[PDB]
Amino acid sequence: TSQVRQNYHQDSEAAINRQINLELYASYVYLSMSYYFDRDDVALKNFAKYFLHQSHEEHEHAHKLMKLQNQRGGRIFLQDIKKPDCDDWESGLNAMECALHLEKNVNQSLLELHKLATDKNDPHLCDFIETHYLNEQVKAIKELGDHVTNLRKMGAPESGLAEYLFDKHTLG
Amino acid sequence: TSQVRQNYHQDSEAAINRQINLELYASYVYLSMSYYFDRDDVALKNFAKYFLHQSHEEHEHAHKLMKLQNQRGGRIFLQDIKKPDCDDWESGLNAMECALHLEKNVNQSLLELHKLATDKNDPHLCDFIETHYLNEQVKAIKELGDHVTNLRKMGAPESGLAEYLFDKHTLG
Amino acid sequence: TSQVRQNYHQDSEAAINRQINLELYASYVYLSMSYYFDRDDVALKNFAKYFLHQSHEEHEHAHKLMKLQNQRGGRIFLQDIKKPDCDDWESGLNAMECALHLEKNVNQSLLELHKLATDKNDPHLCDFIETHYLNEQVKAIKELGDHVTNLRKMGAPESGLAEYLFDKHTLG
Amino acid sequence: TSQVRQNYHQDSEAAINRQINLELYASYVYLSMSYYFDRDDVALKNFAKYFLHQSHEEHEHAHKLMKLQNQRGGRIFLQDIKKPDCDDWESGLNAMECALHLEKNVNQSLLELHKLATDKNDPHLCDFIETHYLNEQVKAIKELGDHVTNLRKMGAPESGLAEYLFDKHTLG
Amino acid sequence: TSQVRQNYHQDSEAAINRQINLELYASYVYLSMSYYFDRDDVALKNFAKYFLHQSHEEHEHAHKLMKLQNQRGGRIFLQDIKKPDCDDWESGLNAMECALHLEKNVNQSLLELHKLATDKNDPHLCDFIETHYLNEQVKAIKELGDHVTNLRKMGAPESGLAEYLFDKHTLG
Amino acid sequence: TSQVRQNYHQDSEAAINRQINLELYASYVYLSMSYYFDRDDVALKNFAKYFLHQSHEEHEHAHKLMKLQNQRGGRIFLQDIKKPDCDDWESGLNAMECALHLEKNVNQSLLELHKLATDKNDPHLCDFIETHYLNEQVKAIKELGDHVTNLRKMGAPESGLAEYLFDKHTLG
Ligand SMILES: [Cu+2]
Ligand SMILES: [Cu+2]
Ligand SMILES: [Cu+2]
Ligand SMILES: [Cu+2]
Ligand SMILES: [Cu+2]
Ligand SMILES: [Cu+2]
Ligand SMILES: [Cu+2]
Ligand SMILES: [Cu+2]
Ligand SMILES: [Cu+2]
Ligand SMILES: [Cu+2]
Ligand SMILES: [Cu+2]
Ligand SMILES: [Cu+2]
């Protein structure tokens, strides 16, 4: 056992490792989206920039989780980072919807992690999740919902002008 | 009677209190509109910012009226601030129309207050109303009329792109 | 249902709306106190400034609650803002005591809200309440208790000199 | 009862007082260590500086706890600050190990305090402990574990050169 | 024996250790006073600040004594830091009187230490005591006497206004 | 076919995709190493910093490759990012040796890619590889060889002092 380990259950360690893998997968999905919008036949530069920024944020989240795993005396168990489900995201609106679904999945995983930590009486882990992840997820979900609503109201995905103007004005 | 009271009729005091309540109600209505446009299924951020600014201005107007009530030796009688008539404003254009109607109602109340003050030979009250409220109301009504005209000409409320572009270019 | 809603119970939404109304009522009470101390026959300017600042803070609290209501996919239901219980607060000390009672009532409402959120397993709501409201309420209650103790020890409300000197030195 | 006291159980107050005493004792232990390393026959200046800084931090923790005790309407009950268990710490590595043990004991006491506060439904106390103490304890334990690991790997306590170089490079 | 020890009698070392314990006890007493005046039912913030500053100064004095103990080749023998005699100090004036008594006790201990050092022909110790402690004690005693005289003349402890105004004007 | 595609063979596109996957895998391996050295029982902070920087550089390389894939009209085909071969790297020296082996493998893959591009008469791809990857790989291999040589000469992995001093002086 680690010399620093204290009130850190094995189930919590395993859940943290699974969350690390999930964050890495989310970063990979966002990277795929970003370079989809960099394609010559899509050419939505600010969509690509937005999704690249999201990928970097997901990477940072994974980094913070690994840092905690080391801090609490747990051991990081890395797994394969699965390829994203889709290679073509078909539009800016569809990509935004997929991002919203992914963020809600990550939020659900974090909520289950918080429930596990509460069941294990690990207040430090609960506070870490609340401070660094829960409100970030809520804000991200709200932002993606706003983007999806605006894109739908502007006439996307049928109206290419809608996605162009959203790219310029909202994501620009 | 107040030691500072001079040429301040009771009817004027009551009308000032009613105007204070009306300004508070207008602030509350604008707050409702602003947080309506902050909703995920509406997501018009600059509309929300505009209506929040209007709410703050209405609050300032109420503050100035209470300050006068104290200055003239009257006593402030606060009443319930009624909830806004609507919780869903259905569009940016409809919200702008409702704001125009509210501002015209406030203007009519101020005109009646000025008429009462003139009938009571209270030149200080008349000058206060003229200096701080009448031209502000005229400018606000003109601005809201311009916004409504522009939104109607752009194709709102049917065209969501119209309200999006108005949000970005005019209110942004 | 809102596209962003996740782990947000209806009871939590209703409690948030009630808390919004309570914060608005507290702001209104503080406004009443502030303009009571601006009266010519009271003339305690820093008491008025203090209570006006408290009113603005309460308004900000209400704003934050409405922002969360939108963030979590809930819908803001506004109610009538009831008039304050008293129009004459009879002294600086009595106003401070009433403010202390109001702050403790708000604190109790927030504690009940936190208990409800815990019962509903909504860690984001619990963390929001803890981060933004609980310690603020504790600090406000402590400050008001200090003010009340100092005013009582100085000889208020019988000693007008006591309230004058407290107005100058503590609230000034 | 205190005029500011609200949702503050007596058991929580007693536990807070015990935690205050524990923090003072930890500060005293760190002071003893620091001036042990200032001895002419030990002469590890940066070890002394490190332990003096730790003592000051422990003092600050005790200060924050007393501040909360006053804020919540509890009454501070001070006890004797027991002398440290050891007067000679025998090495830098042994002192680091003792510091790690002390920090883990403090962490366990804080976890028990958090459990008590949770059992008493005192969310403000729980949030205070999480915000100001839990992560600080985790970081301190991790840092001390790193120091102990490095000292052991360098060949301490047998190798005086190891402790000298650690004093210069890590603690310097 | 220490390699640096020269003309340092054992009795002097023991007296230095006793003085270290006395300084720590004085710091603890001042801390108790400071957080007594931070209570909601006392609420004299500048009294608390003054006594906290005194506690920090006492800590610094203890630090200097331990530094000398190491410098002269003596060994620091730490003892239990006894709890302060009183938990409730009943007023600002009573706290000031207790502080004056404590400072005079510390001064008497330092004078006995100087007499012992003179009897042992240890001029370095005598000069240390004269340079760093004797005049500091005289100044502290004079300041506390001035505070006590002013508080008594203003009408304390019966007049709460007296202690309030002293808190603002002298300690502020 | 892409409207921008010109002199871009399918085999080159597939090789570019494989190189993208290899760069992502290298970044993942470096991340694993970095957080291995952040462990409490390893505690080599500058080793962790070095490997984290290497991971970020590998990520940047992957980014540049994807950018080229889009520029030349190819389509990015992402694959699973395999978990690193090892979870425990057993020392700084062993980690450096593994990094050297990985960099040489990446260099061999890049050389095969350049050979393929030459066989396909794609001078732009050849120049891209030469400008951005070949000399970077040579420099990285040289640096890792220098690190390995220095660690071996200092007595690693048996001498923990060797790895500590290398961590401080070379990687610090
Ligand atoms: Cu994330
Ligand atoms: Cu995310
Ligand atoms: Cu108005
Ligand atoms: Cu208006
Ligand atoms: Cu509030
Ligand atoms: Cu409040
Ligand atoms: Cu501590
Ligand atoms: Cu500690
Ligand atoms: Cu002293
Ligand atoms: Cu002293
Ligand atoms: Cu590379
Ligand atoms: Cu490389």
Amino acid identity for residue F133 in this structure:
Y
- Angle (CA) D98-E16-E146 rounded to 5° is 110
Taking a C-beta distance cutoff of 8 angstroms, is the pair A20, A78 a contact?
Answer: yes
Kind and range of the H or E run holding B41: none
CA distance C167 to A44: 61
The alpha carbon dihedral of B87, B89, B95, B101 has a sign of negative
Amino acid identity for residue B59 in this structure:
H
Taking a C-beta distance cutoff of 8 angstroms, is the pair A163, A93 a contact?
Answer: yes
Exposure letters E126-158 (e unless 16+ CB within 10 A, then b):
bebbeeebeebbeebbebbeebbebbeebebbe
Residue E60 is given by DSSP the state H
CA distance C41 to C31: 18
| DSSP character string of chain A | --TT--S--HHHHHHHHHHHHHHHHHHHHHHHHHHHHTSTTT--HHHHHHHHHHHHHHHHHHHHHHHHHHHTT-------BPPPS-S---SHHHHHHHHHHHHHHHHHHHHHHHHHHHHTT-HHHHHHHIIIIIHHHHHHHHHHHHHHHHHHHHTTTT-HHHHHHHHHHT--
Q: How long, in residues, is chain E? A: 172
How far apart, in Å, are the Cα atoms of D99 and each of D95, D116, D139?
6, 26, 13
Q: Which of D38, D70, D83 sits opposite E40 (nearest CB)?
A: D70
Residues of chain E by 3-state class (helix, strand, coil), percent to 5: 75, 0, 25
How far apart, in Å, are the Cα atoms of C169 and each of E49, E164, E168?
17, 10, 7
CA distance A9 to C32: 54
D131 touches chain F (CB under 8 A): no
Residue whose C-alpha is closest to residue E51's, from E66, E67, E64, E32: E32
Kind and range of the H or E run holding B10: helix B10-37
F76 touches chain D (CB under 8 A): no
Q: Find the ligand nearest to D51 CA.
A: 8
How far apart, in Å, are the Cα atoms of F92 and each of A20, B70, F99, F144?
24, 77, 10, 12
User: Residue E123: which residues within 8 A CB-CB, separation 6 or more?
Assistant: none
- Maximum pairwise Cα distance, chain C: 60
In three state form, how does the secondary structure of chain C look? CCCCCCCCCHHHHHHHHHHHHHHHHHHHHHHHHHHHHCCCCCCCHHHHHHHHHHHHHHHHHHHHHHHHHHHCCCCCCCCCECCCCCCCCCCHHHHHHHHHHHHHHHHHHHHHHHHHHHHCCCHHHHHHHHHHHHHHHHHHHHHHHHHHHHHHHHCCCCCHHHHHHHHHHCCC
Taking a C-beta distance cutoff of 8 angstroms, is the pair C51, C99 a contact?
Answer: yes
Taking a C-beta distance cutoff of 8 angstroms, is the pair D60, E23 a contact?
Answer: no
Taking a C-beta distance cutoff of 8 angstroms, is the pair F2, A41 a contact?
Answer: yes
Residue whose C-alpha is closest to residue C59's, from C29, C97, C93: C29
**Nearest-neighbour CA in chain A from C19: distance (Å):** 20
Integer distance in angstroms from the first to the last C-alpha of chain F? 50
Query: Do the Cβ atoms of B40 and A169 come within 8 Å?
Result: no
Residue whose C-alpha is closest to residue C112's, from D123, A131, D128: D123
Which structure tokens are listed for A124?
Answer: 């430090």
C147 touches chain D (CB under 8 A): no
CA distance A54 to A22: 14
Omega prior to F157 cis, within 30 of 0: yes
Exposure letters E69-78 (e unless 16+ CB within 10 A, then b):
bbebbbbbeb
Omega prior to B84 cis, within 30 of 0: no
The alpha carbon dihedral of F38, F41, F46, F48 has a sign of negative
Count of Cβ atoms closer than 10 Å to residue B106 Cβ: 22
Residue whose C-alpha is closest to residue E93's, from E155, E142, E138, E137: E155
Which structure tokens are listed for F26?
Answer: 């290298």
Q: Which chains touch E (3 or more CB pairs under 8 A)?
A: C, D
Query: Do the Cβ atoms of E4 and D67 come within 8 Å?
Result: no
> H-type helices in chain D, by residue range?
10-37, 45-71, 92-119, 123-129, 135-154, 160-169
User: Residue F88: which residues within 8 A CB-CB, separation 6 or more?
Assistant: F36
User: Residue C32: which residues within 8 A CB-CB, separation 6 or more?
Assistant: B76, B78, C84, C86, C87, C89
In three state form, how does the secondary structure of F100-166 look? HHHHHHHHHHHHHHHHHHHHCCCHHHHHHHHHHHHHHHHHHHHHHHHHHHHHHHHCCCCCHHHHHHH
Kindly identify which residue of chain E lies nearest to residue D62, measuring between CA atoms: E31
User: Residue A117: which residues within 8 A CB-CB, separation 6 or more?
Assistant: A12, A125, A126, A129
**SS3 call for D81:** strand
| DSSP character string of A69-99 | HHHTT-------BPPPS-S---SHHHHHHHH
Query: Do the Cβ atoms of B39 and C67 come within 8 Å?
Result: no
Determine phi and psi for C81, rounding to 5 degrees.
-90, 110
CA distance E10 to E101: 29
What residues of chain E lie within 8 A of the CB of C154, using their CB?
160-161, 164
D131 touches chain A (CB under 8 A): yes
For helices B45-71 and B92-119, what crossing angle results, to 10°?
Answer: 10
CA distance C151 to A164: 64
CA distance C157 to C163: 7
Residue F82 is given by DSSP the state P
Residue whose C-alpha is closest to residue B52's, from B91, B99, B110: B99
Count of Cβ atoms closer than 10 Å to residue F56 Cβ: 15
Residue whose C-alpha is closest to residue D34's, from D12, D22, D50: D50
**Nearest-neighbour CA in chain C from A135: distance (Å):** 6
Best of F35, F36, F38, F41 to disrupt the D interface by mutation (most D CBs within 10 Å)?
F41
Residue E92 CA to ligand 12 center (angstroms) comes to 70
User: Residue A55: which residues within 8 A CB-CB, separation 6 or more?
Assistant: A27, A28, A30, A31, A34
CA distance B72 to F101: 88
Q: Which of C41, C66, C83 sits opposite B79 (nearest CB)?
A: C83
Taking a C-beta distance cutoff of 8 angstroms, is the pair A8, A72 a contact?
Answer: yes
Taking a C-beta distance cutoff of 8 angstroms, is the pair E3, D41 a contact?
Answer: yes
What residues of chain F lie within 8 A of the CB of A42, using their CB?
none
Q: Which of D111, D129, D138 sits opposite A71 (nearest CB)?
A: D138
Residue whose C-alpha is closest to residue D111's, from A12, A125, A131: A125
Q: Which of A115, A118, A145 sits opposite C3 (nearest CB)?
A: A145
**Nearest-neighbour CA in chain D from E118: distance (Å):** 25
**SS3 call for B43:** coil
Residue whose C-alpha is closest to residue C69's, from C80, C58, C77, C79: C77
Count of Cβ atoms closer than 10 Å to residue F77 Cβ: 15
Taking a C-beta distance cutoff of 8 angstroms, is the pair E140, E103 a contact?
Answer: yes
Resolution attained, angstroms:
1.8
Kind and range of the H or E run holding E89: none
Best of A146, A161, A168, A170 to disrupt the B interface by mutation (most B CBs within 10 Å)?
A146
What residues of chain C lie within 8 A of the CB of A135, using their CB?
124, 127-128
**Nearest-neighbour CA in chain D from A80: distance (Å):** 28
Kind and range of the H or E run holding B147: helix B135-154
According to DSSP, the residues that pair with D81 across neighbouring strands are E81
**Nearest-neighbour CA in chain A from B52: distance (Å):** 19
What residues of chain D lie within 8 A of the CB of C148, using their CB?
3
CA distance B168 to B147: 13
| Residue tagged 């800084």 (tokens) | D53
Kindly identify which residue of chain D lies nearest to residue C111, measuring between CA atoms: D123
What residues of chain C lie within 8 A of the CB of D121, using their CB?
111, 115
CA distance C46 to C165: 11
**Nearest-neighbour CA in chain A from F4: distance (Å):** 7
User: Residue C45: which residues within 8 A CB-CB, separation 6 or more?
Assistant: C37, C38, C167
CA distance E59 to E29: 11
E43 touches chain D (CB under 8 A): no
A138 touches chain D (CB under 8 A): no
Kind and range of the H or E run holding B155: none
**SS3 call for B81:** strand
Exposure letters C48-83 (e unless 16+ CB within 10 A, then b):
bbbbbebbebbbebbbebbebbbbbbbbbebeebeb
For helices B160-169 and B92-119, what crossing angle results, to 10°?
Answer: 60
Residue D133 CA to ligand 8 center (angstroms) comes to 9
According to DSSP, the residues that pair with C81 across neighbouring strands are B81
- Maximum pairwise Cα distance, chain F: 60
For helices F10-37 and F92-119, what crossing angle results, to 10°?
Answer: 170
CA distance F118 to F112: 10
What residues of chain D lie within 8 A of the CB of A126, using their CB?
130
Residue E130 is given by DSSP the state I
Taking a C-beta distance cutoff of 8 angstroms, is the pair A76, A20 a contact?
Answer: yes
Q: CB-side exposure of F123: number of CA atoms within 13 Å?
A: 0
Q: CB-side exposure of E92: number of CA atoms within 13 Å?
A: 36
Burial (CB count within 10 angstroms: exposed 0-12, middle 13-18, buried 19+), residue B149:
exposed
Residue pairs spanning C and E at CB distance below 8 A: 35
Query: Do the Cβ atoms of B39 and C75 come within 8 Å?
Result: yes
